[model samples]
Target: GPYLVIVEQPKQRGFRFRYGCEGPSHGGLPGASSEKGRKTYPTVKICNYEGPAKIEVDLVTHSDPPRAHAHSLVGKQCSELGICAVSVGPKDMTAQFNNLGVLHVTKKNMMGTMIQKLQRQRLRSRPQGLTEAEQRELEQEAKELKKVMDLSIVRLRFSAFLRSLPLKPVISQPIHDSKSPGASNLKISRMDKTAGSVRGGDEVYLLCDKVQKDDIEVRFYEDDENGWQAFGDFSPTDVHKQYAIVFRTPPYHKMKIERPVTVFLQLKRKRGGDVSDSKQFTYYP
Candidate 1:
């Protein structure tokens, strides 16, 4: 049996043809030349495609015998120039081509469908600009961050004012005084244990009062002939309930057996601004 084929041509014109023939033979018609008995070429429209082009024909049949038969015919016709043919199952029968700068192909496989589905979803889910809901959400976040920035500027002002104050005489002077202006009402008042044994690996708790739990951070350091040695930071016990902190002592070298070290604690606020006031502890090893 032969199947009819409709070929779409340039300018949207179309033509129909039989399995392997151009048109039906005309017999005994007026002035029928011997050339009328001759079979014409298969289809030249495909061969006329401009630029670099390729045509792949697949012949799929149910049985091995028919498969071979289909391949023999399709293979010969598709063998000329940039045309090719292969034997496959019915599902594998597809045609595709790239002519000039355009690419046209069959989209029948699972891979093709999956990629097309994603592309459609991505294109349809959003337009040229942000959605109304998303735009509003971002605007709110930006406004909140701006308020934090303003507060940070005020914190910087308070820090500068405190630094300008002269040092007050005291029976015991701090390693370095932060003298924070208390703009944000945060301070570290006392440590649970002021002194730690020199052997190292001892833990202490700090009590800070009038502090904003979400706004304060702490660090520990030691001052000696080598200037300042950082012992890292402290962790808050509670975010809103308590201002207590847990800290640890770094091991002291045995060479400083009889040496006494001064430890200091620092506090900071977020958004690139921190206070200058610091508290001290004495470490004896």
Candidate 2:
């Protein structure tokens, strides 16, 4: 069975936190703390995930119809969307999709481990001058040593995996709190507000930091003799520690002889990034 894709809402953003989605009973349990500071909670659990769904990101950028921001960050780092899990099909199925894996650890750790394994193997390949019997004994010793090393490697992996198992953080902020911690460091890297053609139905793309887990929303409007006219609205999902969004250009939006469209985004904070600030951009199209 595929794992469930749950829209998680974290209460805090930018601050480091340890959260468990699946608790002892696998039931609903909010965050908890112990007198000794030991933490406990229902792991942020999500099951019933469907097959491959393309997760996309968008934000306000200067480019017309921003470039496609794929799920490259899928296996790279687990930041904004801390843990992404899909269910396994059967009991015999490997752990590929069954686990509550963090994106950063899952993708990078394996590669790092594999690299280390190869390095150790290469080192062990060093030739040792010895008699036939001695050679056999030495080879066996090498094999055993390799086993021990591998076991140690497994222990390291398990520890890291455990650390990454916790739920991701969320956050929120005022639209203009520039003095906020995340506000000063926050940046709008890219924009792909519309998918195509600047006239209408255009999409947007935005790039921010890896810690900016705030859920983002975008708005659009037109200008008339009266003033700015609200025309359309959209809110894009966070991606690659950045803000990525896709929305249709407001129908009444006009760039020439009219007010340019302004896109506003609201970010829902997660565990790591600053939720105290907001960002805006205008498109001439």
Candidate 3:
């Protein structure tokens, strides 16, 4: 008799289901019902496999409809599932993966979304002056509310999976924080090479204030017949402390036209942090 089994494959988008023959001697577990009162039963195979098989980063610049941003920060760094499961963010100083799972790590630039939400909240109800105890209690309530509000369906699923594992961390950190002082209003002053169209894999220096140097990231977006495309995340090292960032542009497909296409460039924070508005940059290819 033929039976089905789950197998783990490298570089697969999700889980891989495979067909296997365990012979007629194989049997089912205790208390499990057998189909048609048959003694010989099929065995269930479960494989411990999890990871992103195919990662596509959007490259198109924000245009008429205004598309979302995609940058491959985690997908690039943690290439394999094992590495991703063990990796941790800044908050978890000691054990990696001690705070959050990799699935919760998203490349979607939600800075504007979060900022606008906060502004609306403030406008709706501006907190008046209150006693010290009252103010403290109000802040504590807000913190708890934010935890529930920030958990999306996708993240909730990841949390369930993490709970099933013995290696899961006891202490969990907030999914995201929009109230951090440095979280809002990051500005990019200027780009050193802002003139003509630049080639693929070119180096460009950006001068920006009110940003952490090591946390700086750049993403490239281009528009074509297929609509907007994203070139993923680019690591920009800090120059002169937190003042400037030096980054090499991601390689892009060559254009058919002699005229250069307008490529949109923007800065992002890797760990679900704030992002700067996209700036115009001409690409030769």
Candidate 4:
């Protein structure tokens, strides 16, 4: 009595949600499990049906009842409202919708602009004077949509199967923005030379995780009432790839040290103002 929409193919874990700045042609959303061996894209297969059918894919959020997402769909078959419609039929009741790009646009919480895109798509379907009933509902829902915002606020998991046999959206995993560390986190694993001369010219080979060459710094400091601090000198070229650094330690403020002076040194991500765990370094008199 009911036809099921089974999204057994890749549910877009490998696929990236692109912003307007990136432009187009970044390409298709891939299956979550396709990385290891098999390659799969966003696909849906119809069950309990045996004839030609049409299905349209639209972006929906993880909100209470789901609302139209401003992040439209791009790629080969997608349309103006980020709608991608395809035909599936008598052959095997299976349809795979590849060549779909997530198109994101605008900035600054464009409230009216967001709703503008939402109503534009569905209005084509409801030709009856724009139906005040749903228009009121959308205006109410659109406000709620803006509140539940994340980088990739829209979750494709619970989506629309608008038109055709029936509506059944089997949610995929939480599809947040494809993000990682590096620009935000800093780490120093090892340093070739921990002890350096107080006179300041000391070559130290440091090993670290991810650090931006342009924004890297080695900060050495002595903490106290009269705290002293110095930055290790090195050009961006000294960063050997993203993991190694060949830098010279900065001279201690008190040049004429009597004996070995213990100080703390840490890696710094200058742009993001991030710092790694402090490591001990000694300066000889």
Candidate 5:
């Protein structure tokens, strides 16, 4: 038995494949946020996206196994070079790359439909340049940040301001390193909480700017009998600057945690060292 697939050019970038977003069963919203709303942005997702480029698929199928047969062909089409398939499925199907047929492979995944869906939502969600309100604020703060970037008191003031902002973004600077905390002001942010004692299947929304460089690290940690156990670490940048990390809690949805579970956002030197100042947040369900 086979299912009909209608392949078309993606409307956005980063989509790896087509699935829940466009399916009529999922409200035909074409993206996660559209279907789940803004609150669930962290857990909501497009099928696959590594970067700006995306994989392209062919228009119609006329093979023997058809839909079911396409599953085994995954590996054949996807390669270390890139994805090489006309038909793709969810990650769990274990699609064989070798069977996927002729595809433009690359070091990155080229699935664009899934990425396009994600892009469509985020790009359309807002204006690009700052609004008048935001511009004024940034212009004013930029001067102050620039001033601190030059002085020896850079560490103390940077540390203080880092904690002052709403949901202070994970940041790190030595009490003495006066290097400009480059681009500490221009960043998007997000945060989230885990669900109950259950170990997995919980979600959190975090601003993406927290992981912009070698200066910071945002990770998930839970208290254990001995101390805290880290589940995941998201480091997004490698500059002496300010950034954010947007991520979801671990997927191990079966492990239950003790009440009053606490997670921390650790901002440390890129080369590795203690934090100039670390912010701790708790997860309560």
Candidate 6:
């Protein structure tokens, strides 16, 4: 039976691993090629033999050794990373996976015993080469992660299986950043108003994806003949649940303008200096 199992890789970046404080269903893991609104999820396919088969998903650490992860996959279908069984029949060559929300491990459970024994040679079905020295380094890496407190963010590997057999190589593991906020894309979804006066005291309600209020700023800039830039006027208090922001436009560098001037404004982060796609804004004379 020349059967091959393939687990599609999830999106590599910008996926948040929700903490216990957040709901059990913040969002689901998306496929590598997924986009906003028209979203996609993890999928597995069986080639050669398209008969009835079963599939399973496992959680592994993203570190060098890549041992079994302590965190659980909380959501429909996936109960702690092992969904038991998924039917793959002739009707469909691939099975689309259900949404999975990664639940963080608290300090109390962080010291829990490791699970599964993936021996040296069988460390991964993807690659097969690890010296004793490298194995030691991997174990040490796990030890360090356990010792460190407030481990807010960590990347994870999702291993796919057919019966007891492993699938083809899964590349680019997915990350779960609980409070890092770096995991979420810095995007401004919408804004109440687009035009403001040259004096720049216009109140704007900016709707956007999750952002760390303490580390974010509203950047209004003109990528014109010259670089003219300024930040929005607001405090952390104006940021609502990391989703929306209530702020005033910063004063324009030039107070007087005879005609309407168009510029771009975006959400910027202080720490990463990352900014969302700039939106159009106009200043009326």
Q: Which candidate is the best by lDDT?
A: 4
List candidate 2 stretches off by more than 4 Å: 1-12, 18-188, 192-199, 208-216, 220-243, 251-276, 283-285
* Cα RMSD for candidates in order: 36.0, 17.8, 22.1, 11.1, 23.3, 6.9
Candidate 1 residue-wise lDDT, 72-170, digit = tens = 112232442212332222232222211211011112232332233333334564764446675565455444433332111110000001112221111
Which regions in candidate 3 have their CA more than 4 angstroms from the true location?
1-181, 195-198, 223-239, 255-257
Task: Determine which window of 10 residues in candidate 3 has minimal summed lDDT.
Answer: 8-17
**Between candidates 2 and 3, the lDDT winner:** 3
- TM-score per prediction, in order, is 0.31, 0.23, 0.33, 0.54, 0.26, 0.57
Q: What is the model-wide C-alpha lDDT for candidate 5? A: 0.30
Where model 4 places Cα greater than 4 Å from the true spot, the runs are: 9-14, 121-144, 157-165, 179-285
Locate the minimum summed-lDDT window of 10 residues in model 4: 176-185
Q: In candidate 6, where is summed lDDT lowest over 10 consecutive residues?
A: 112-121
- For residues 111-185, write the lDDT of model 6, one tens digit per residue: 442322333224655576667886666566556757643344443343444545655534245454635665566
Worst-scoring 10-residue span by lDDT in model 5: 154-163
User: Rank by TM-score, descending?
Assistant: 6, 4, 3, 1, 5, 2
For model 3, what is the C-alpha lDDT against the true structure? Answer: 0.37
Cα deviation at 123, candidate 4, in Å, is 4.0
Q: Which has the greatest TM-score?
A: 6
Query: What C-alpha lDDT, on a 0 to 100 scale, does residue 28 get in candidate 3?
Result: 16
Which of 3 and 5 is ahead in lDDT? 3
In candidate 2 the C-alpha lDDT for residue 280 amounts to 55
lDDT accuracy of residue 131 in candidate 6:
70
Q: List the residue pairs that clash in candidate 6.
A: none
lDDT of 4 by residue, 44-81 (tens): 77666645666677676656466566677777777776
Q: What is the C-alpha lDDT of each candidate?
A: 0.35, 0.31, 0.37, 0.69, 0.30, 0.68
Which ranges in model 5 have alpha carbons more than 4 Å from their true place? 1-175, 182-197, 200-211, 222-225, 231-242, 251-254, 257-260, 276-285
lDDT of 5 by residue, 88-138 (tens): 233321221112221211212322322332233334557555556665554
lDDT of 6: 0.68
Candidate 1 residues lying further than 4 Å off, grouped into runs, are 1-185, 210-217, 222-225, 232-242, 252-255, 269-273
